[PDB]
């Protein structure tokens with residue numbers, strides 16, 4: 083229940099659409115990618131411009147409404163919808179302006195990654211981002227953003243040159259390396275904690291065809307494959323990216339039918355560079371076990387981005403446990419394989435990513451992103467359909483994480499689950515957390531923006 | 541030179557971005573995909589809403605400025621930029637709202653196809669459109685729209701249920717099967733003649749992974765290959781799509797070095813349905829010649845959409861000559877193969893497409909789109925870099941068209957080049973042209989919207 087004159091001012095300033103609990107499209111509009119999050123906002127505000135976002139931020143502040151901000155809706159913690167507050171929904175703000183000559187993209191805060199990649203790839207350009215096309219640019223970038231171009235070109239934030247952001251007081255600011263640089267440091271890794279980013283500006287790279295391979299190894303050869311991977315990646319050129327996704331084999335025709343539904347290692351790899359050299363490089367890492375269901379192709383970068391994940395199934399419910407590693411020992415490898423063998427849903431993956439490369443050459447305190455120096459990421463990404471099965475899949479992720487606890491440190495804020503609100507200090511570390519609290523105290527002293535991996539002020 | 545009060549009235553209502561000739565980004569903003577078209581507008585109005593388009597249309601009408609309308613800028617005739625007028629530039633109106641439950645997408649008139657496919661594929665949904673992701677949804681749909689899903693699900697227009705359209709008098713209309721149906725018939729194939737479409741609504745289809753192959757055949761085997769293709773497609777199920785792209789072989793590692801840069805047939809095919817049936821279906825048509833550089837993949841639809849074309853290179857300059865055929869005779873085939881052997885540029889293709897299927901089952905009078913009953917499309921699509929070579933690549937497409945033209949009928953308005961303004965009556969046929977002229981008399985009597993394949997009123 084809201085103050086009528088304040089609501090009137092808000093509606094008058096707001097050119098976008100307002101979705102109320104009684105409108106037919108409220109239920110669909112309040113659903114986010116993590117279907118285990120069922121929440122009922124008081125109001126959904128579909129913003130169409132920066133002044134729309136200003137109006138919405140101001141209205142939430144005057145009304146005392148809990149603020150959720152939504153880009154693409156992919157929050158693994160469920161942060162983009164609230165019970166009883168306002169959803170500042172940016173999904174209609176999807177435009178990208180690309181300069182081919184200047185190698186620049188200016189993208190609104192509601193963009194979906196596939197819209198961005200399409201727009202830059204019209205000119206054979208790109209900048210690093212995540213591997214699934216319908217992820218939102220917004221939350222991803224603000225937490226760091228990594229994927230197929232990161233070992234070559236860094237995190238998304240390593241290519242961000244400025245933002246336009248609406249702060250909790252209703253003001254609009256530009257943050258860059260030369261203008262409000264403390265805020266610029268903080269948004270590069272600090273999440274939505276300091277305001278609503280309504281435009282991101284990135285430097286772009288020329289990225290022609292990329293030689294790519296995806297294949298599946300039997301878990302019988304699991305030890306030799308994973309050891310080959312971790313050995314190789316410690317000295318591999320930045321141009322090679324090679325990731326392992328332990329999962330049940332999808333029922334696709336390139337795979338023998340007797341392997342369908344059984345745990346396997348799906349290995350995906352690419353070479354950012356000359357495709358003839360890439361072919362040589364990928365053949366050099368494809369044979370540590372027998373590759374089943376091998377697909378090799380020379381792909382436009384936009385098609386590489388659109389390819390993940392084999393099977394093309396969107397799961398309804400998810401639960402993720404994740405952390406970094408500094409090393410992947412033989413015993414950690416057996417633990418990984420032991421829990422991979424117990425995967426139950428065909429949409430679960432136990433992901434082993436190797437970052438390093440350009441990501442680790444950025445000095446640690448240049449941004450708010452922690453753990454550049456830990457090259458391994460393990461993500462126990464449980465995903466399933468049946469709501470009566472939540473406990474069994476959640477358990478797989480939780481137990482696997484616990485079993486590897488001796489090897490795991492830190493944690494990517496963008497892979498954190500709904501129950502992980504207190505992993506924040508550990509993820510960032512004490513020095514970064516303290517600096518972030520100081521920027522929080524300057525720019526969001528009332529913690530208006532607290533549906534995120536939250537950094538309280540002071 | 542503009543009346544101040546008229547300009548002030550525009551600025552009072554307009555909330556978008558203006559680009560003037562002295563502005564930094566003028567030169568990139570006025571460039572369109574057909575780089576041979578070098579024109580200099582008085583003003584680029586980058587609209588961000590339906591009221592922006594209303595103000596821009598009324599401003600152009602009141603000011604006497606010639607109106608260009610831009611969606612993705614892919615006009616093969618160069619229609620989306622004008623000398624001395626206003627470009628009503630829709631590229632920032634890129635938002636797509638998808639309802640998974642309703643299997644509906646509402647897309648703004650400025651969307652790029654890859655933005656649209658990213659948004660629908662977030663819900664494993666799709667609807668037919670062209671094969672290159674950076675194509676604009678607006679000009680494509682308005683001329684009809686065909687691609688990988690068309691044999692199965694029709695043209696884009698066969699999945700179109702309504703539009704929001706700003707007409708030349710500045711009013712906003714809805715056209716659907718229930719509201720202004722006369723206009724609705726016309727916008728489904730009649731281009732931007734009737735007003736600026738600010739929103740399209742589409743029915744969507746559930747489209748999971750699709751089995752896909754691309755391979756290259758030597759021109760030595762051209763005759764048996766093309767004859768096998770035309771014979772197979774005559775009775776093929778709707779679920780198989782199979783296209784031939786004659787071109788120079790790209791210098792990719794999957795192809796033998798001795799074929800790089802030589803004329804070949806690039807055959808691409810896919811099955812829209814079960815991927816195991818798809819594998820059986822494609823294996824059966826892959827071997828009409830010896831398949832070199834063979835890539836087979838089981839792809840998310842969004843990645844099939846991002847795949848075209850092998851080499852992933854964007855030409856600066858293009859020149860197109862196209863038509864339909866009712867049958868592809870042996871004599872036509874020989875001519876095709878003879879002119880393909882003369883291809884000079886690595887970006888040129890001679891395209892041989894087979895539509896039919898669900899496109900041909902829509903009654904001919906049901907939309908403004910002509911030649912549903914001709915299943916063959918040939919497109920001599922010259923593309924290149926160096927402006928000093930225009931004559932040699934233009935001559936190639938002209939002479940191939942002339943040597944085939946007796947077998948050709950009609951022409952897709954979206955493949956017309958800048959010198960084909962005179963092909964309009966013939967492309968549409970007498971009946972459709974006459975009905976379109978009456979809709980023109982009703983909705984754009986002053987031909988404000990004449991930078992398109994134009995239908996003058998009455």
Ligand SMILES: Cc1cc2nc3c(=O)[nH]c(=O)nc-3n(C[C@H](O)[C@H](O)[C@H](O)COP(=O)(O)OP(=O)(O)OC[C@H]3O[C@@H](n4cnc5c(N)ncnc54)[C@H](O)[C@@H]3O)c2cc1C
Nearest residue numbers: 153154155156157162191212213218220221222228274279
């Ligand atoms: C299928 C899938 C694949 C993924 N793949 C990758 C990957 O390859 N690499 C990677 O690094 N991450 C990846 N992620 C994680 C992703 O980075 C996070 O889920 C991220 O938060 C997604 O942002 P979003 O805008 O879609 O989500 P949302 O749910 O909308 O928002 C996430 C958070 O950011 C805030 N927020 C969002 N937009 C804005 C904005 N414009 N301004 C201010 N705050 C904002 C929200 O308030 C919230 O705290 C993936 C996630 C999914 C579900």
Ligand SMILES: Cc1cc2nc3c(=O)[nH]c(=O)nc-3n(C[C@H](O)[C@H](O)[C@H](O)COP(=O)(O)OP(=O)(O)OC[C@H]3O[C@@H](n4cnc5c(N)ncnc54)[C@H](O)[C@@H]3O)c2cc1C
Nearest residue numbers: 611612613614615620649670671676678679686732737992
């Ligand atoms: C590389 C490439 C690949 C292609 N592939 C295919 C394909 O596979 N299938 C296919 O069917 N076509 C294909 N096309 C052709 C495409 O359909 C036409 O070029 C179409 O006109 C492109 O639309 P656009 O919005 O990008 O172009 P623009 O240059 O922006 O516009 C084209 C015309 O439409 C008008 N217009 C654009 N948007 C609107 C709007 N919202 N309301 C009113 N008028 C509007 C413009 O005024 C102009 O007359 C391809 C084109 C290219 C260059």
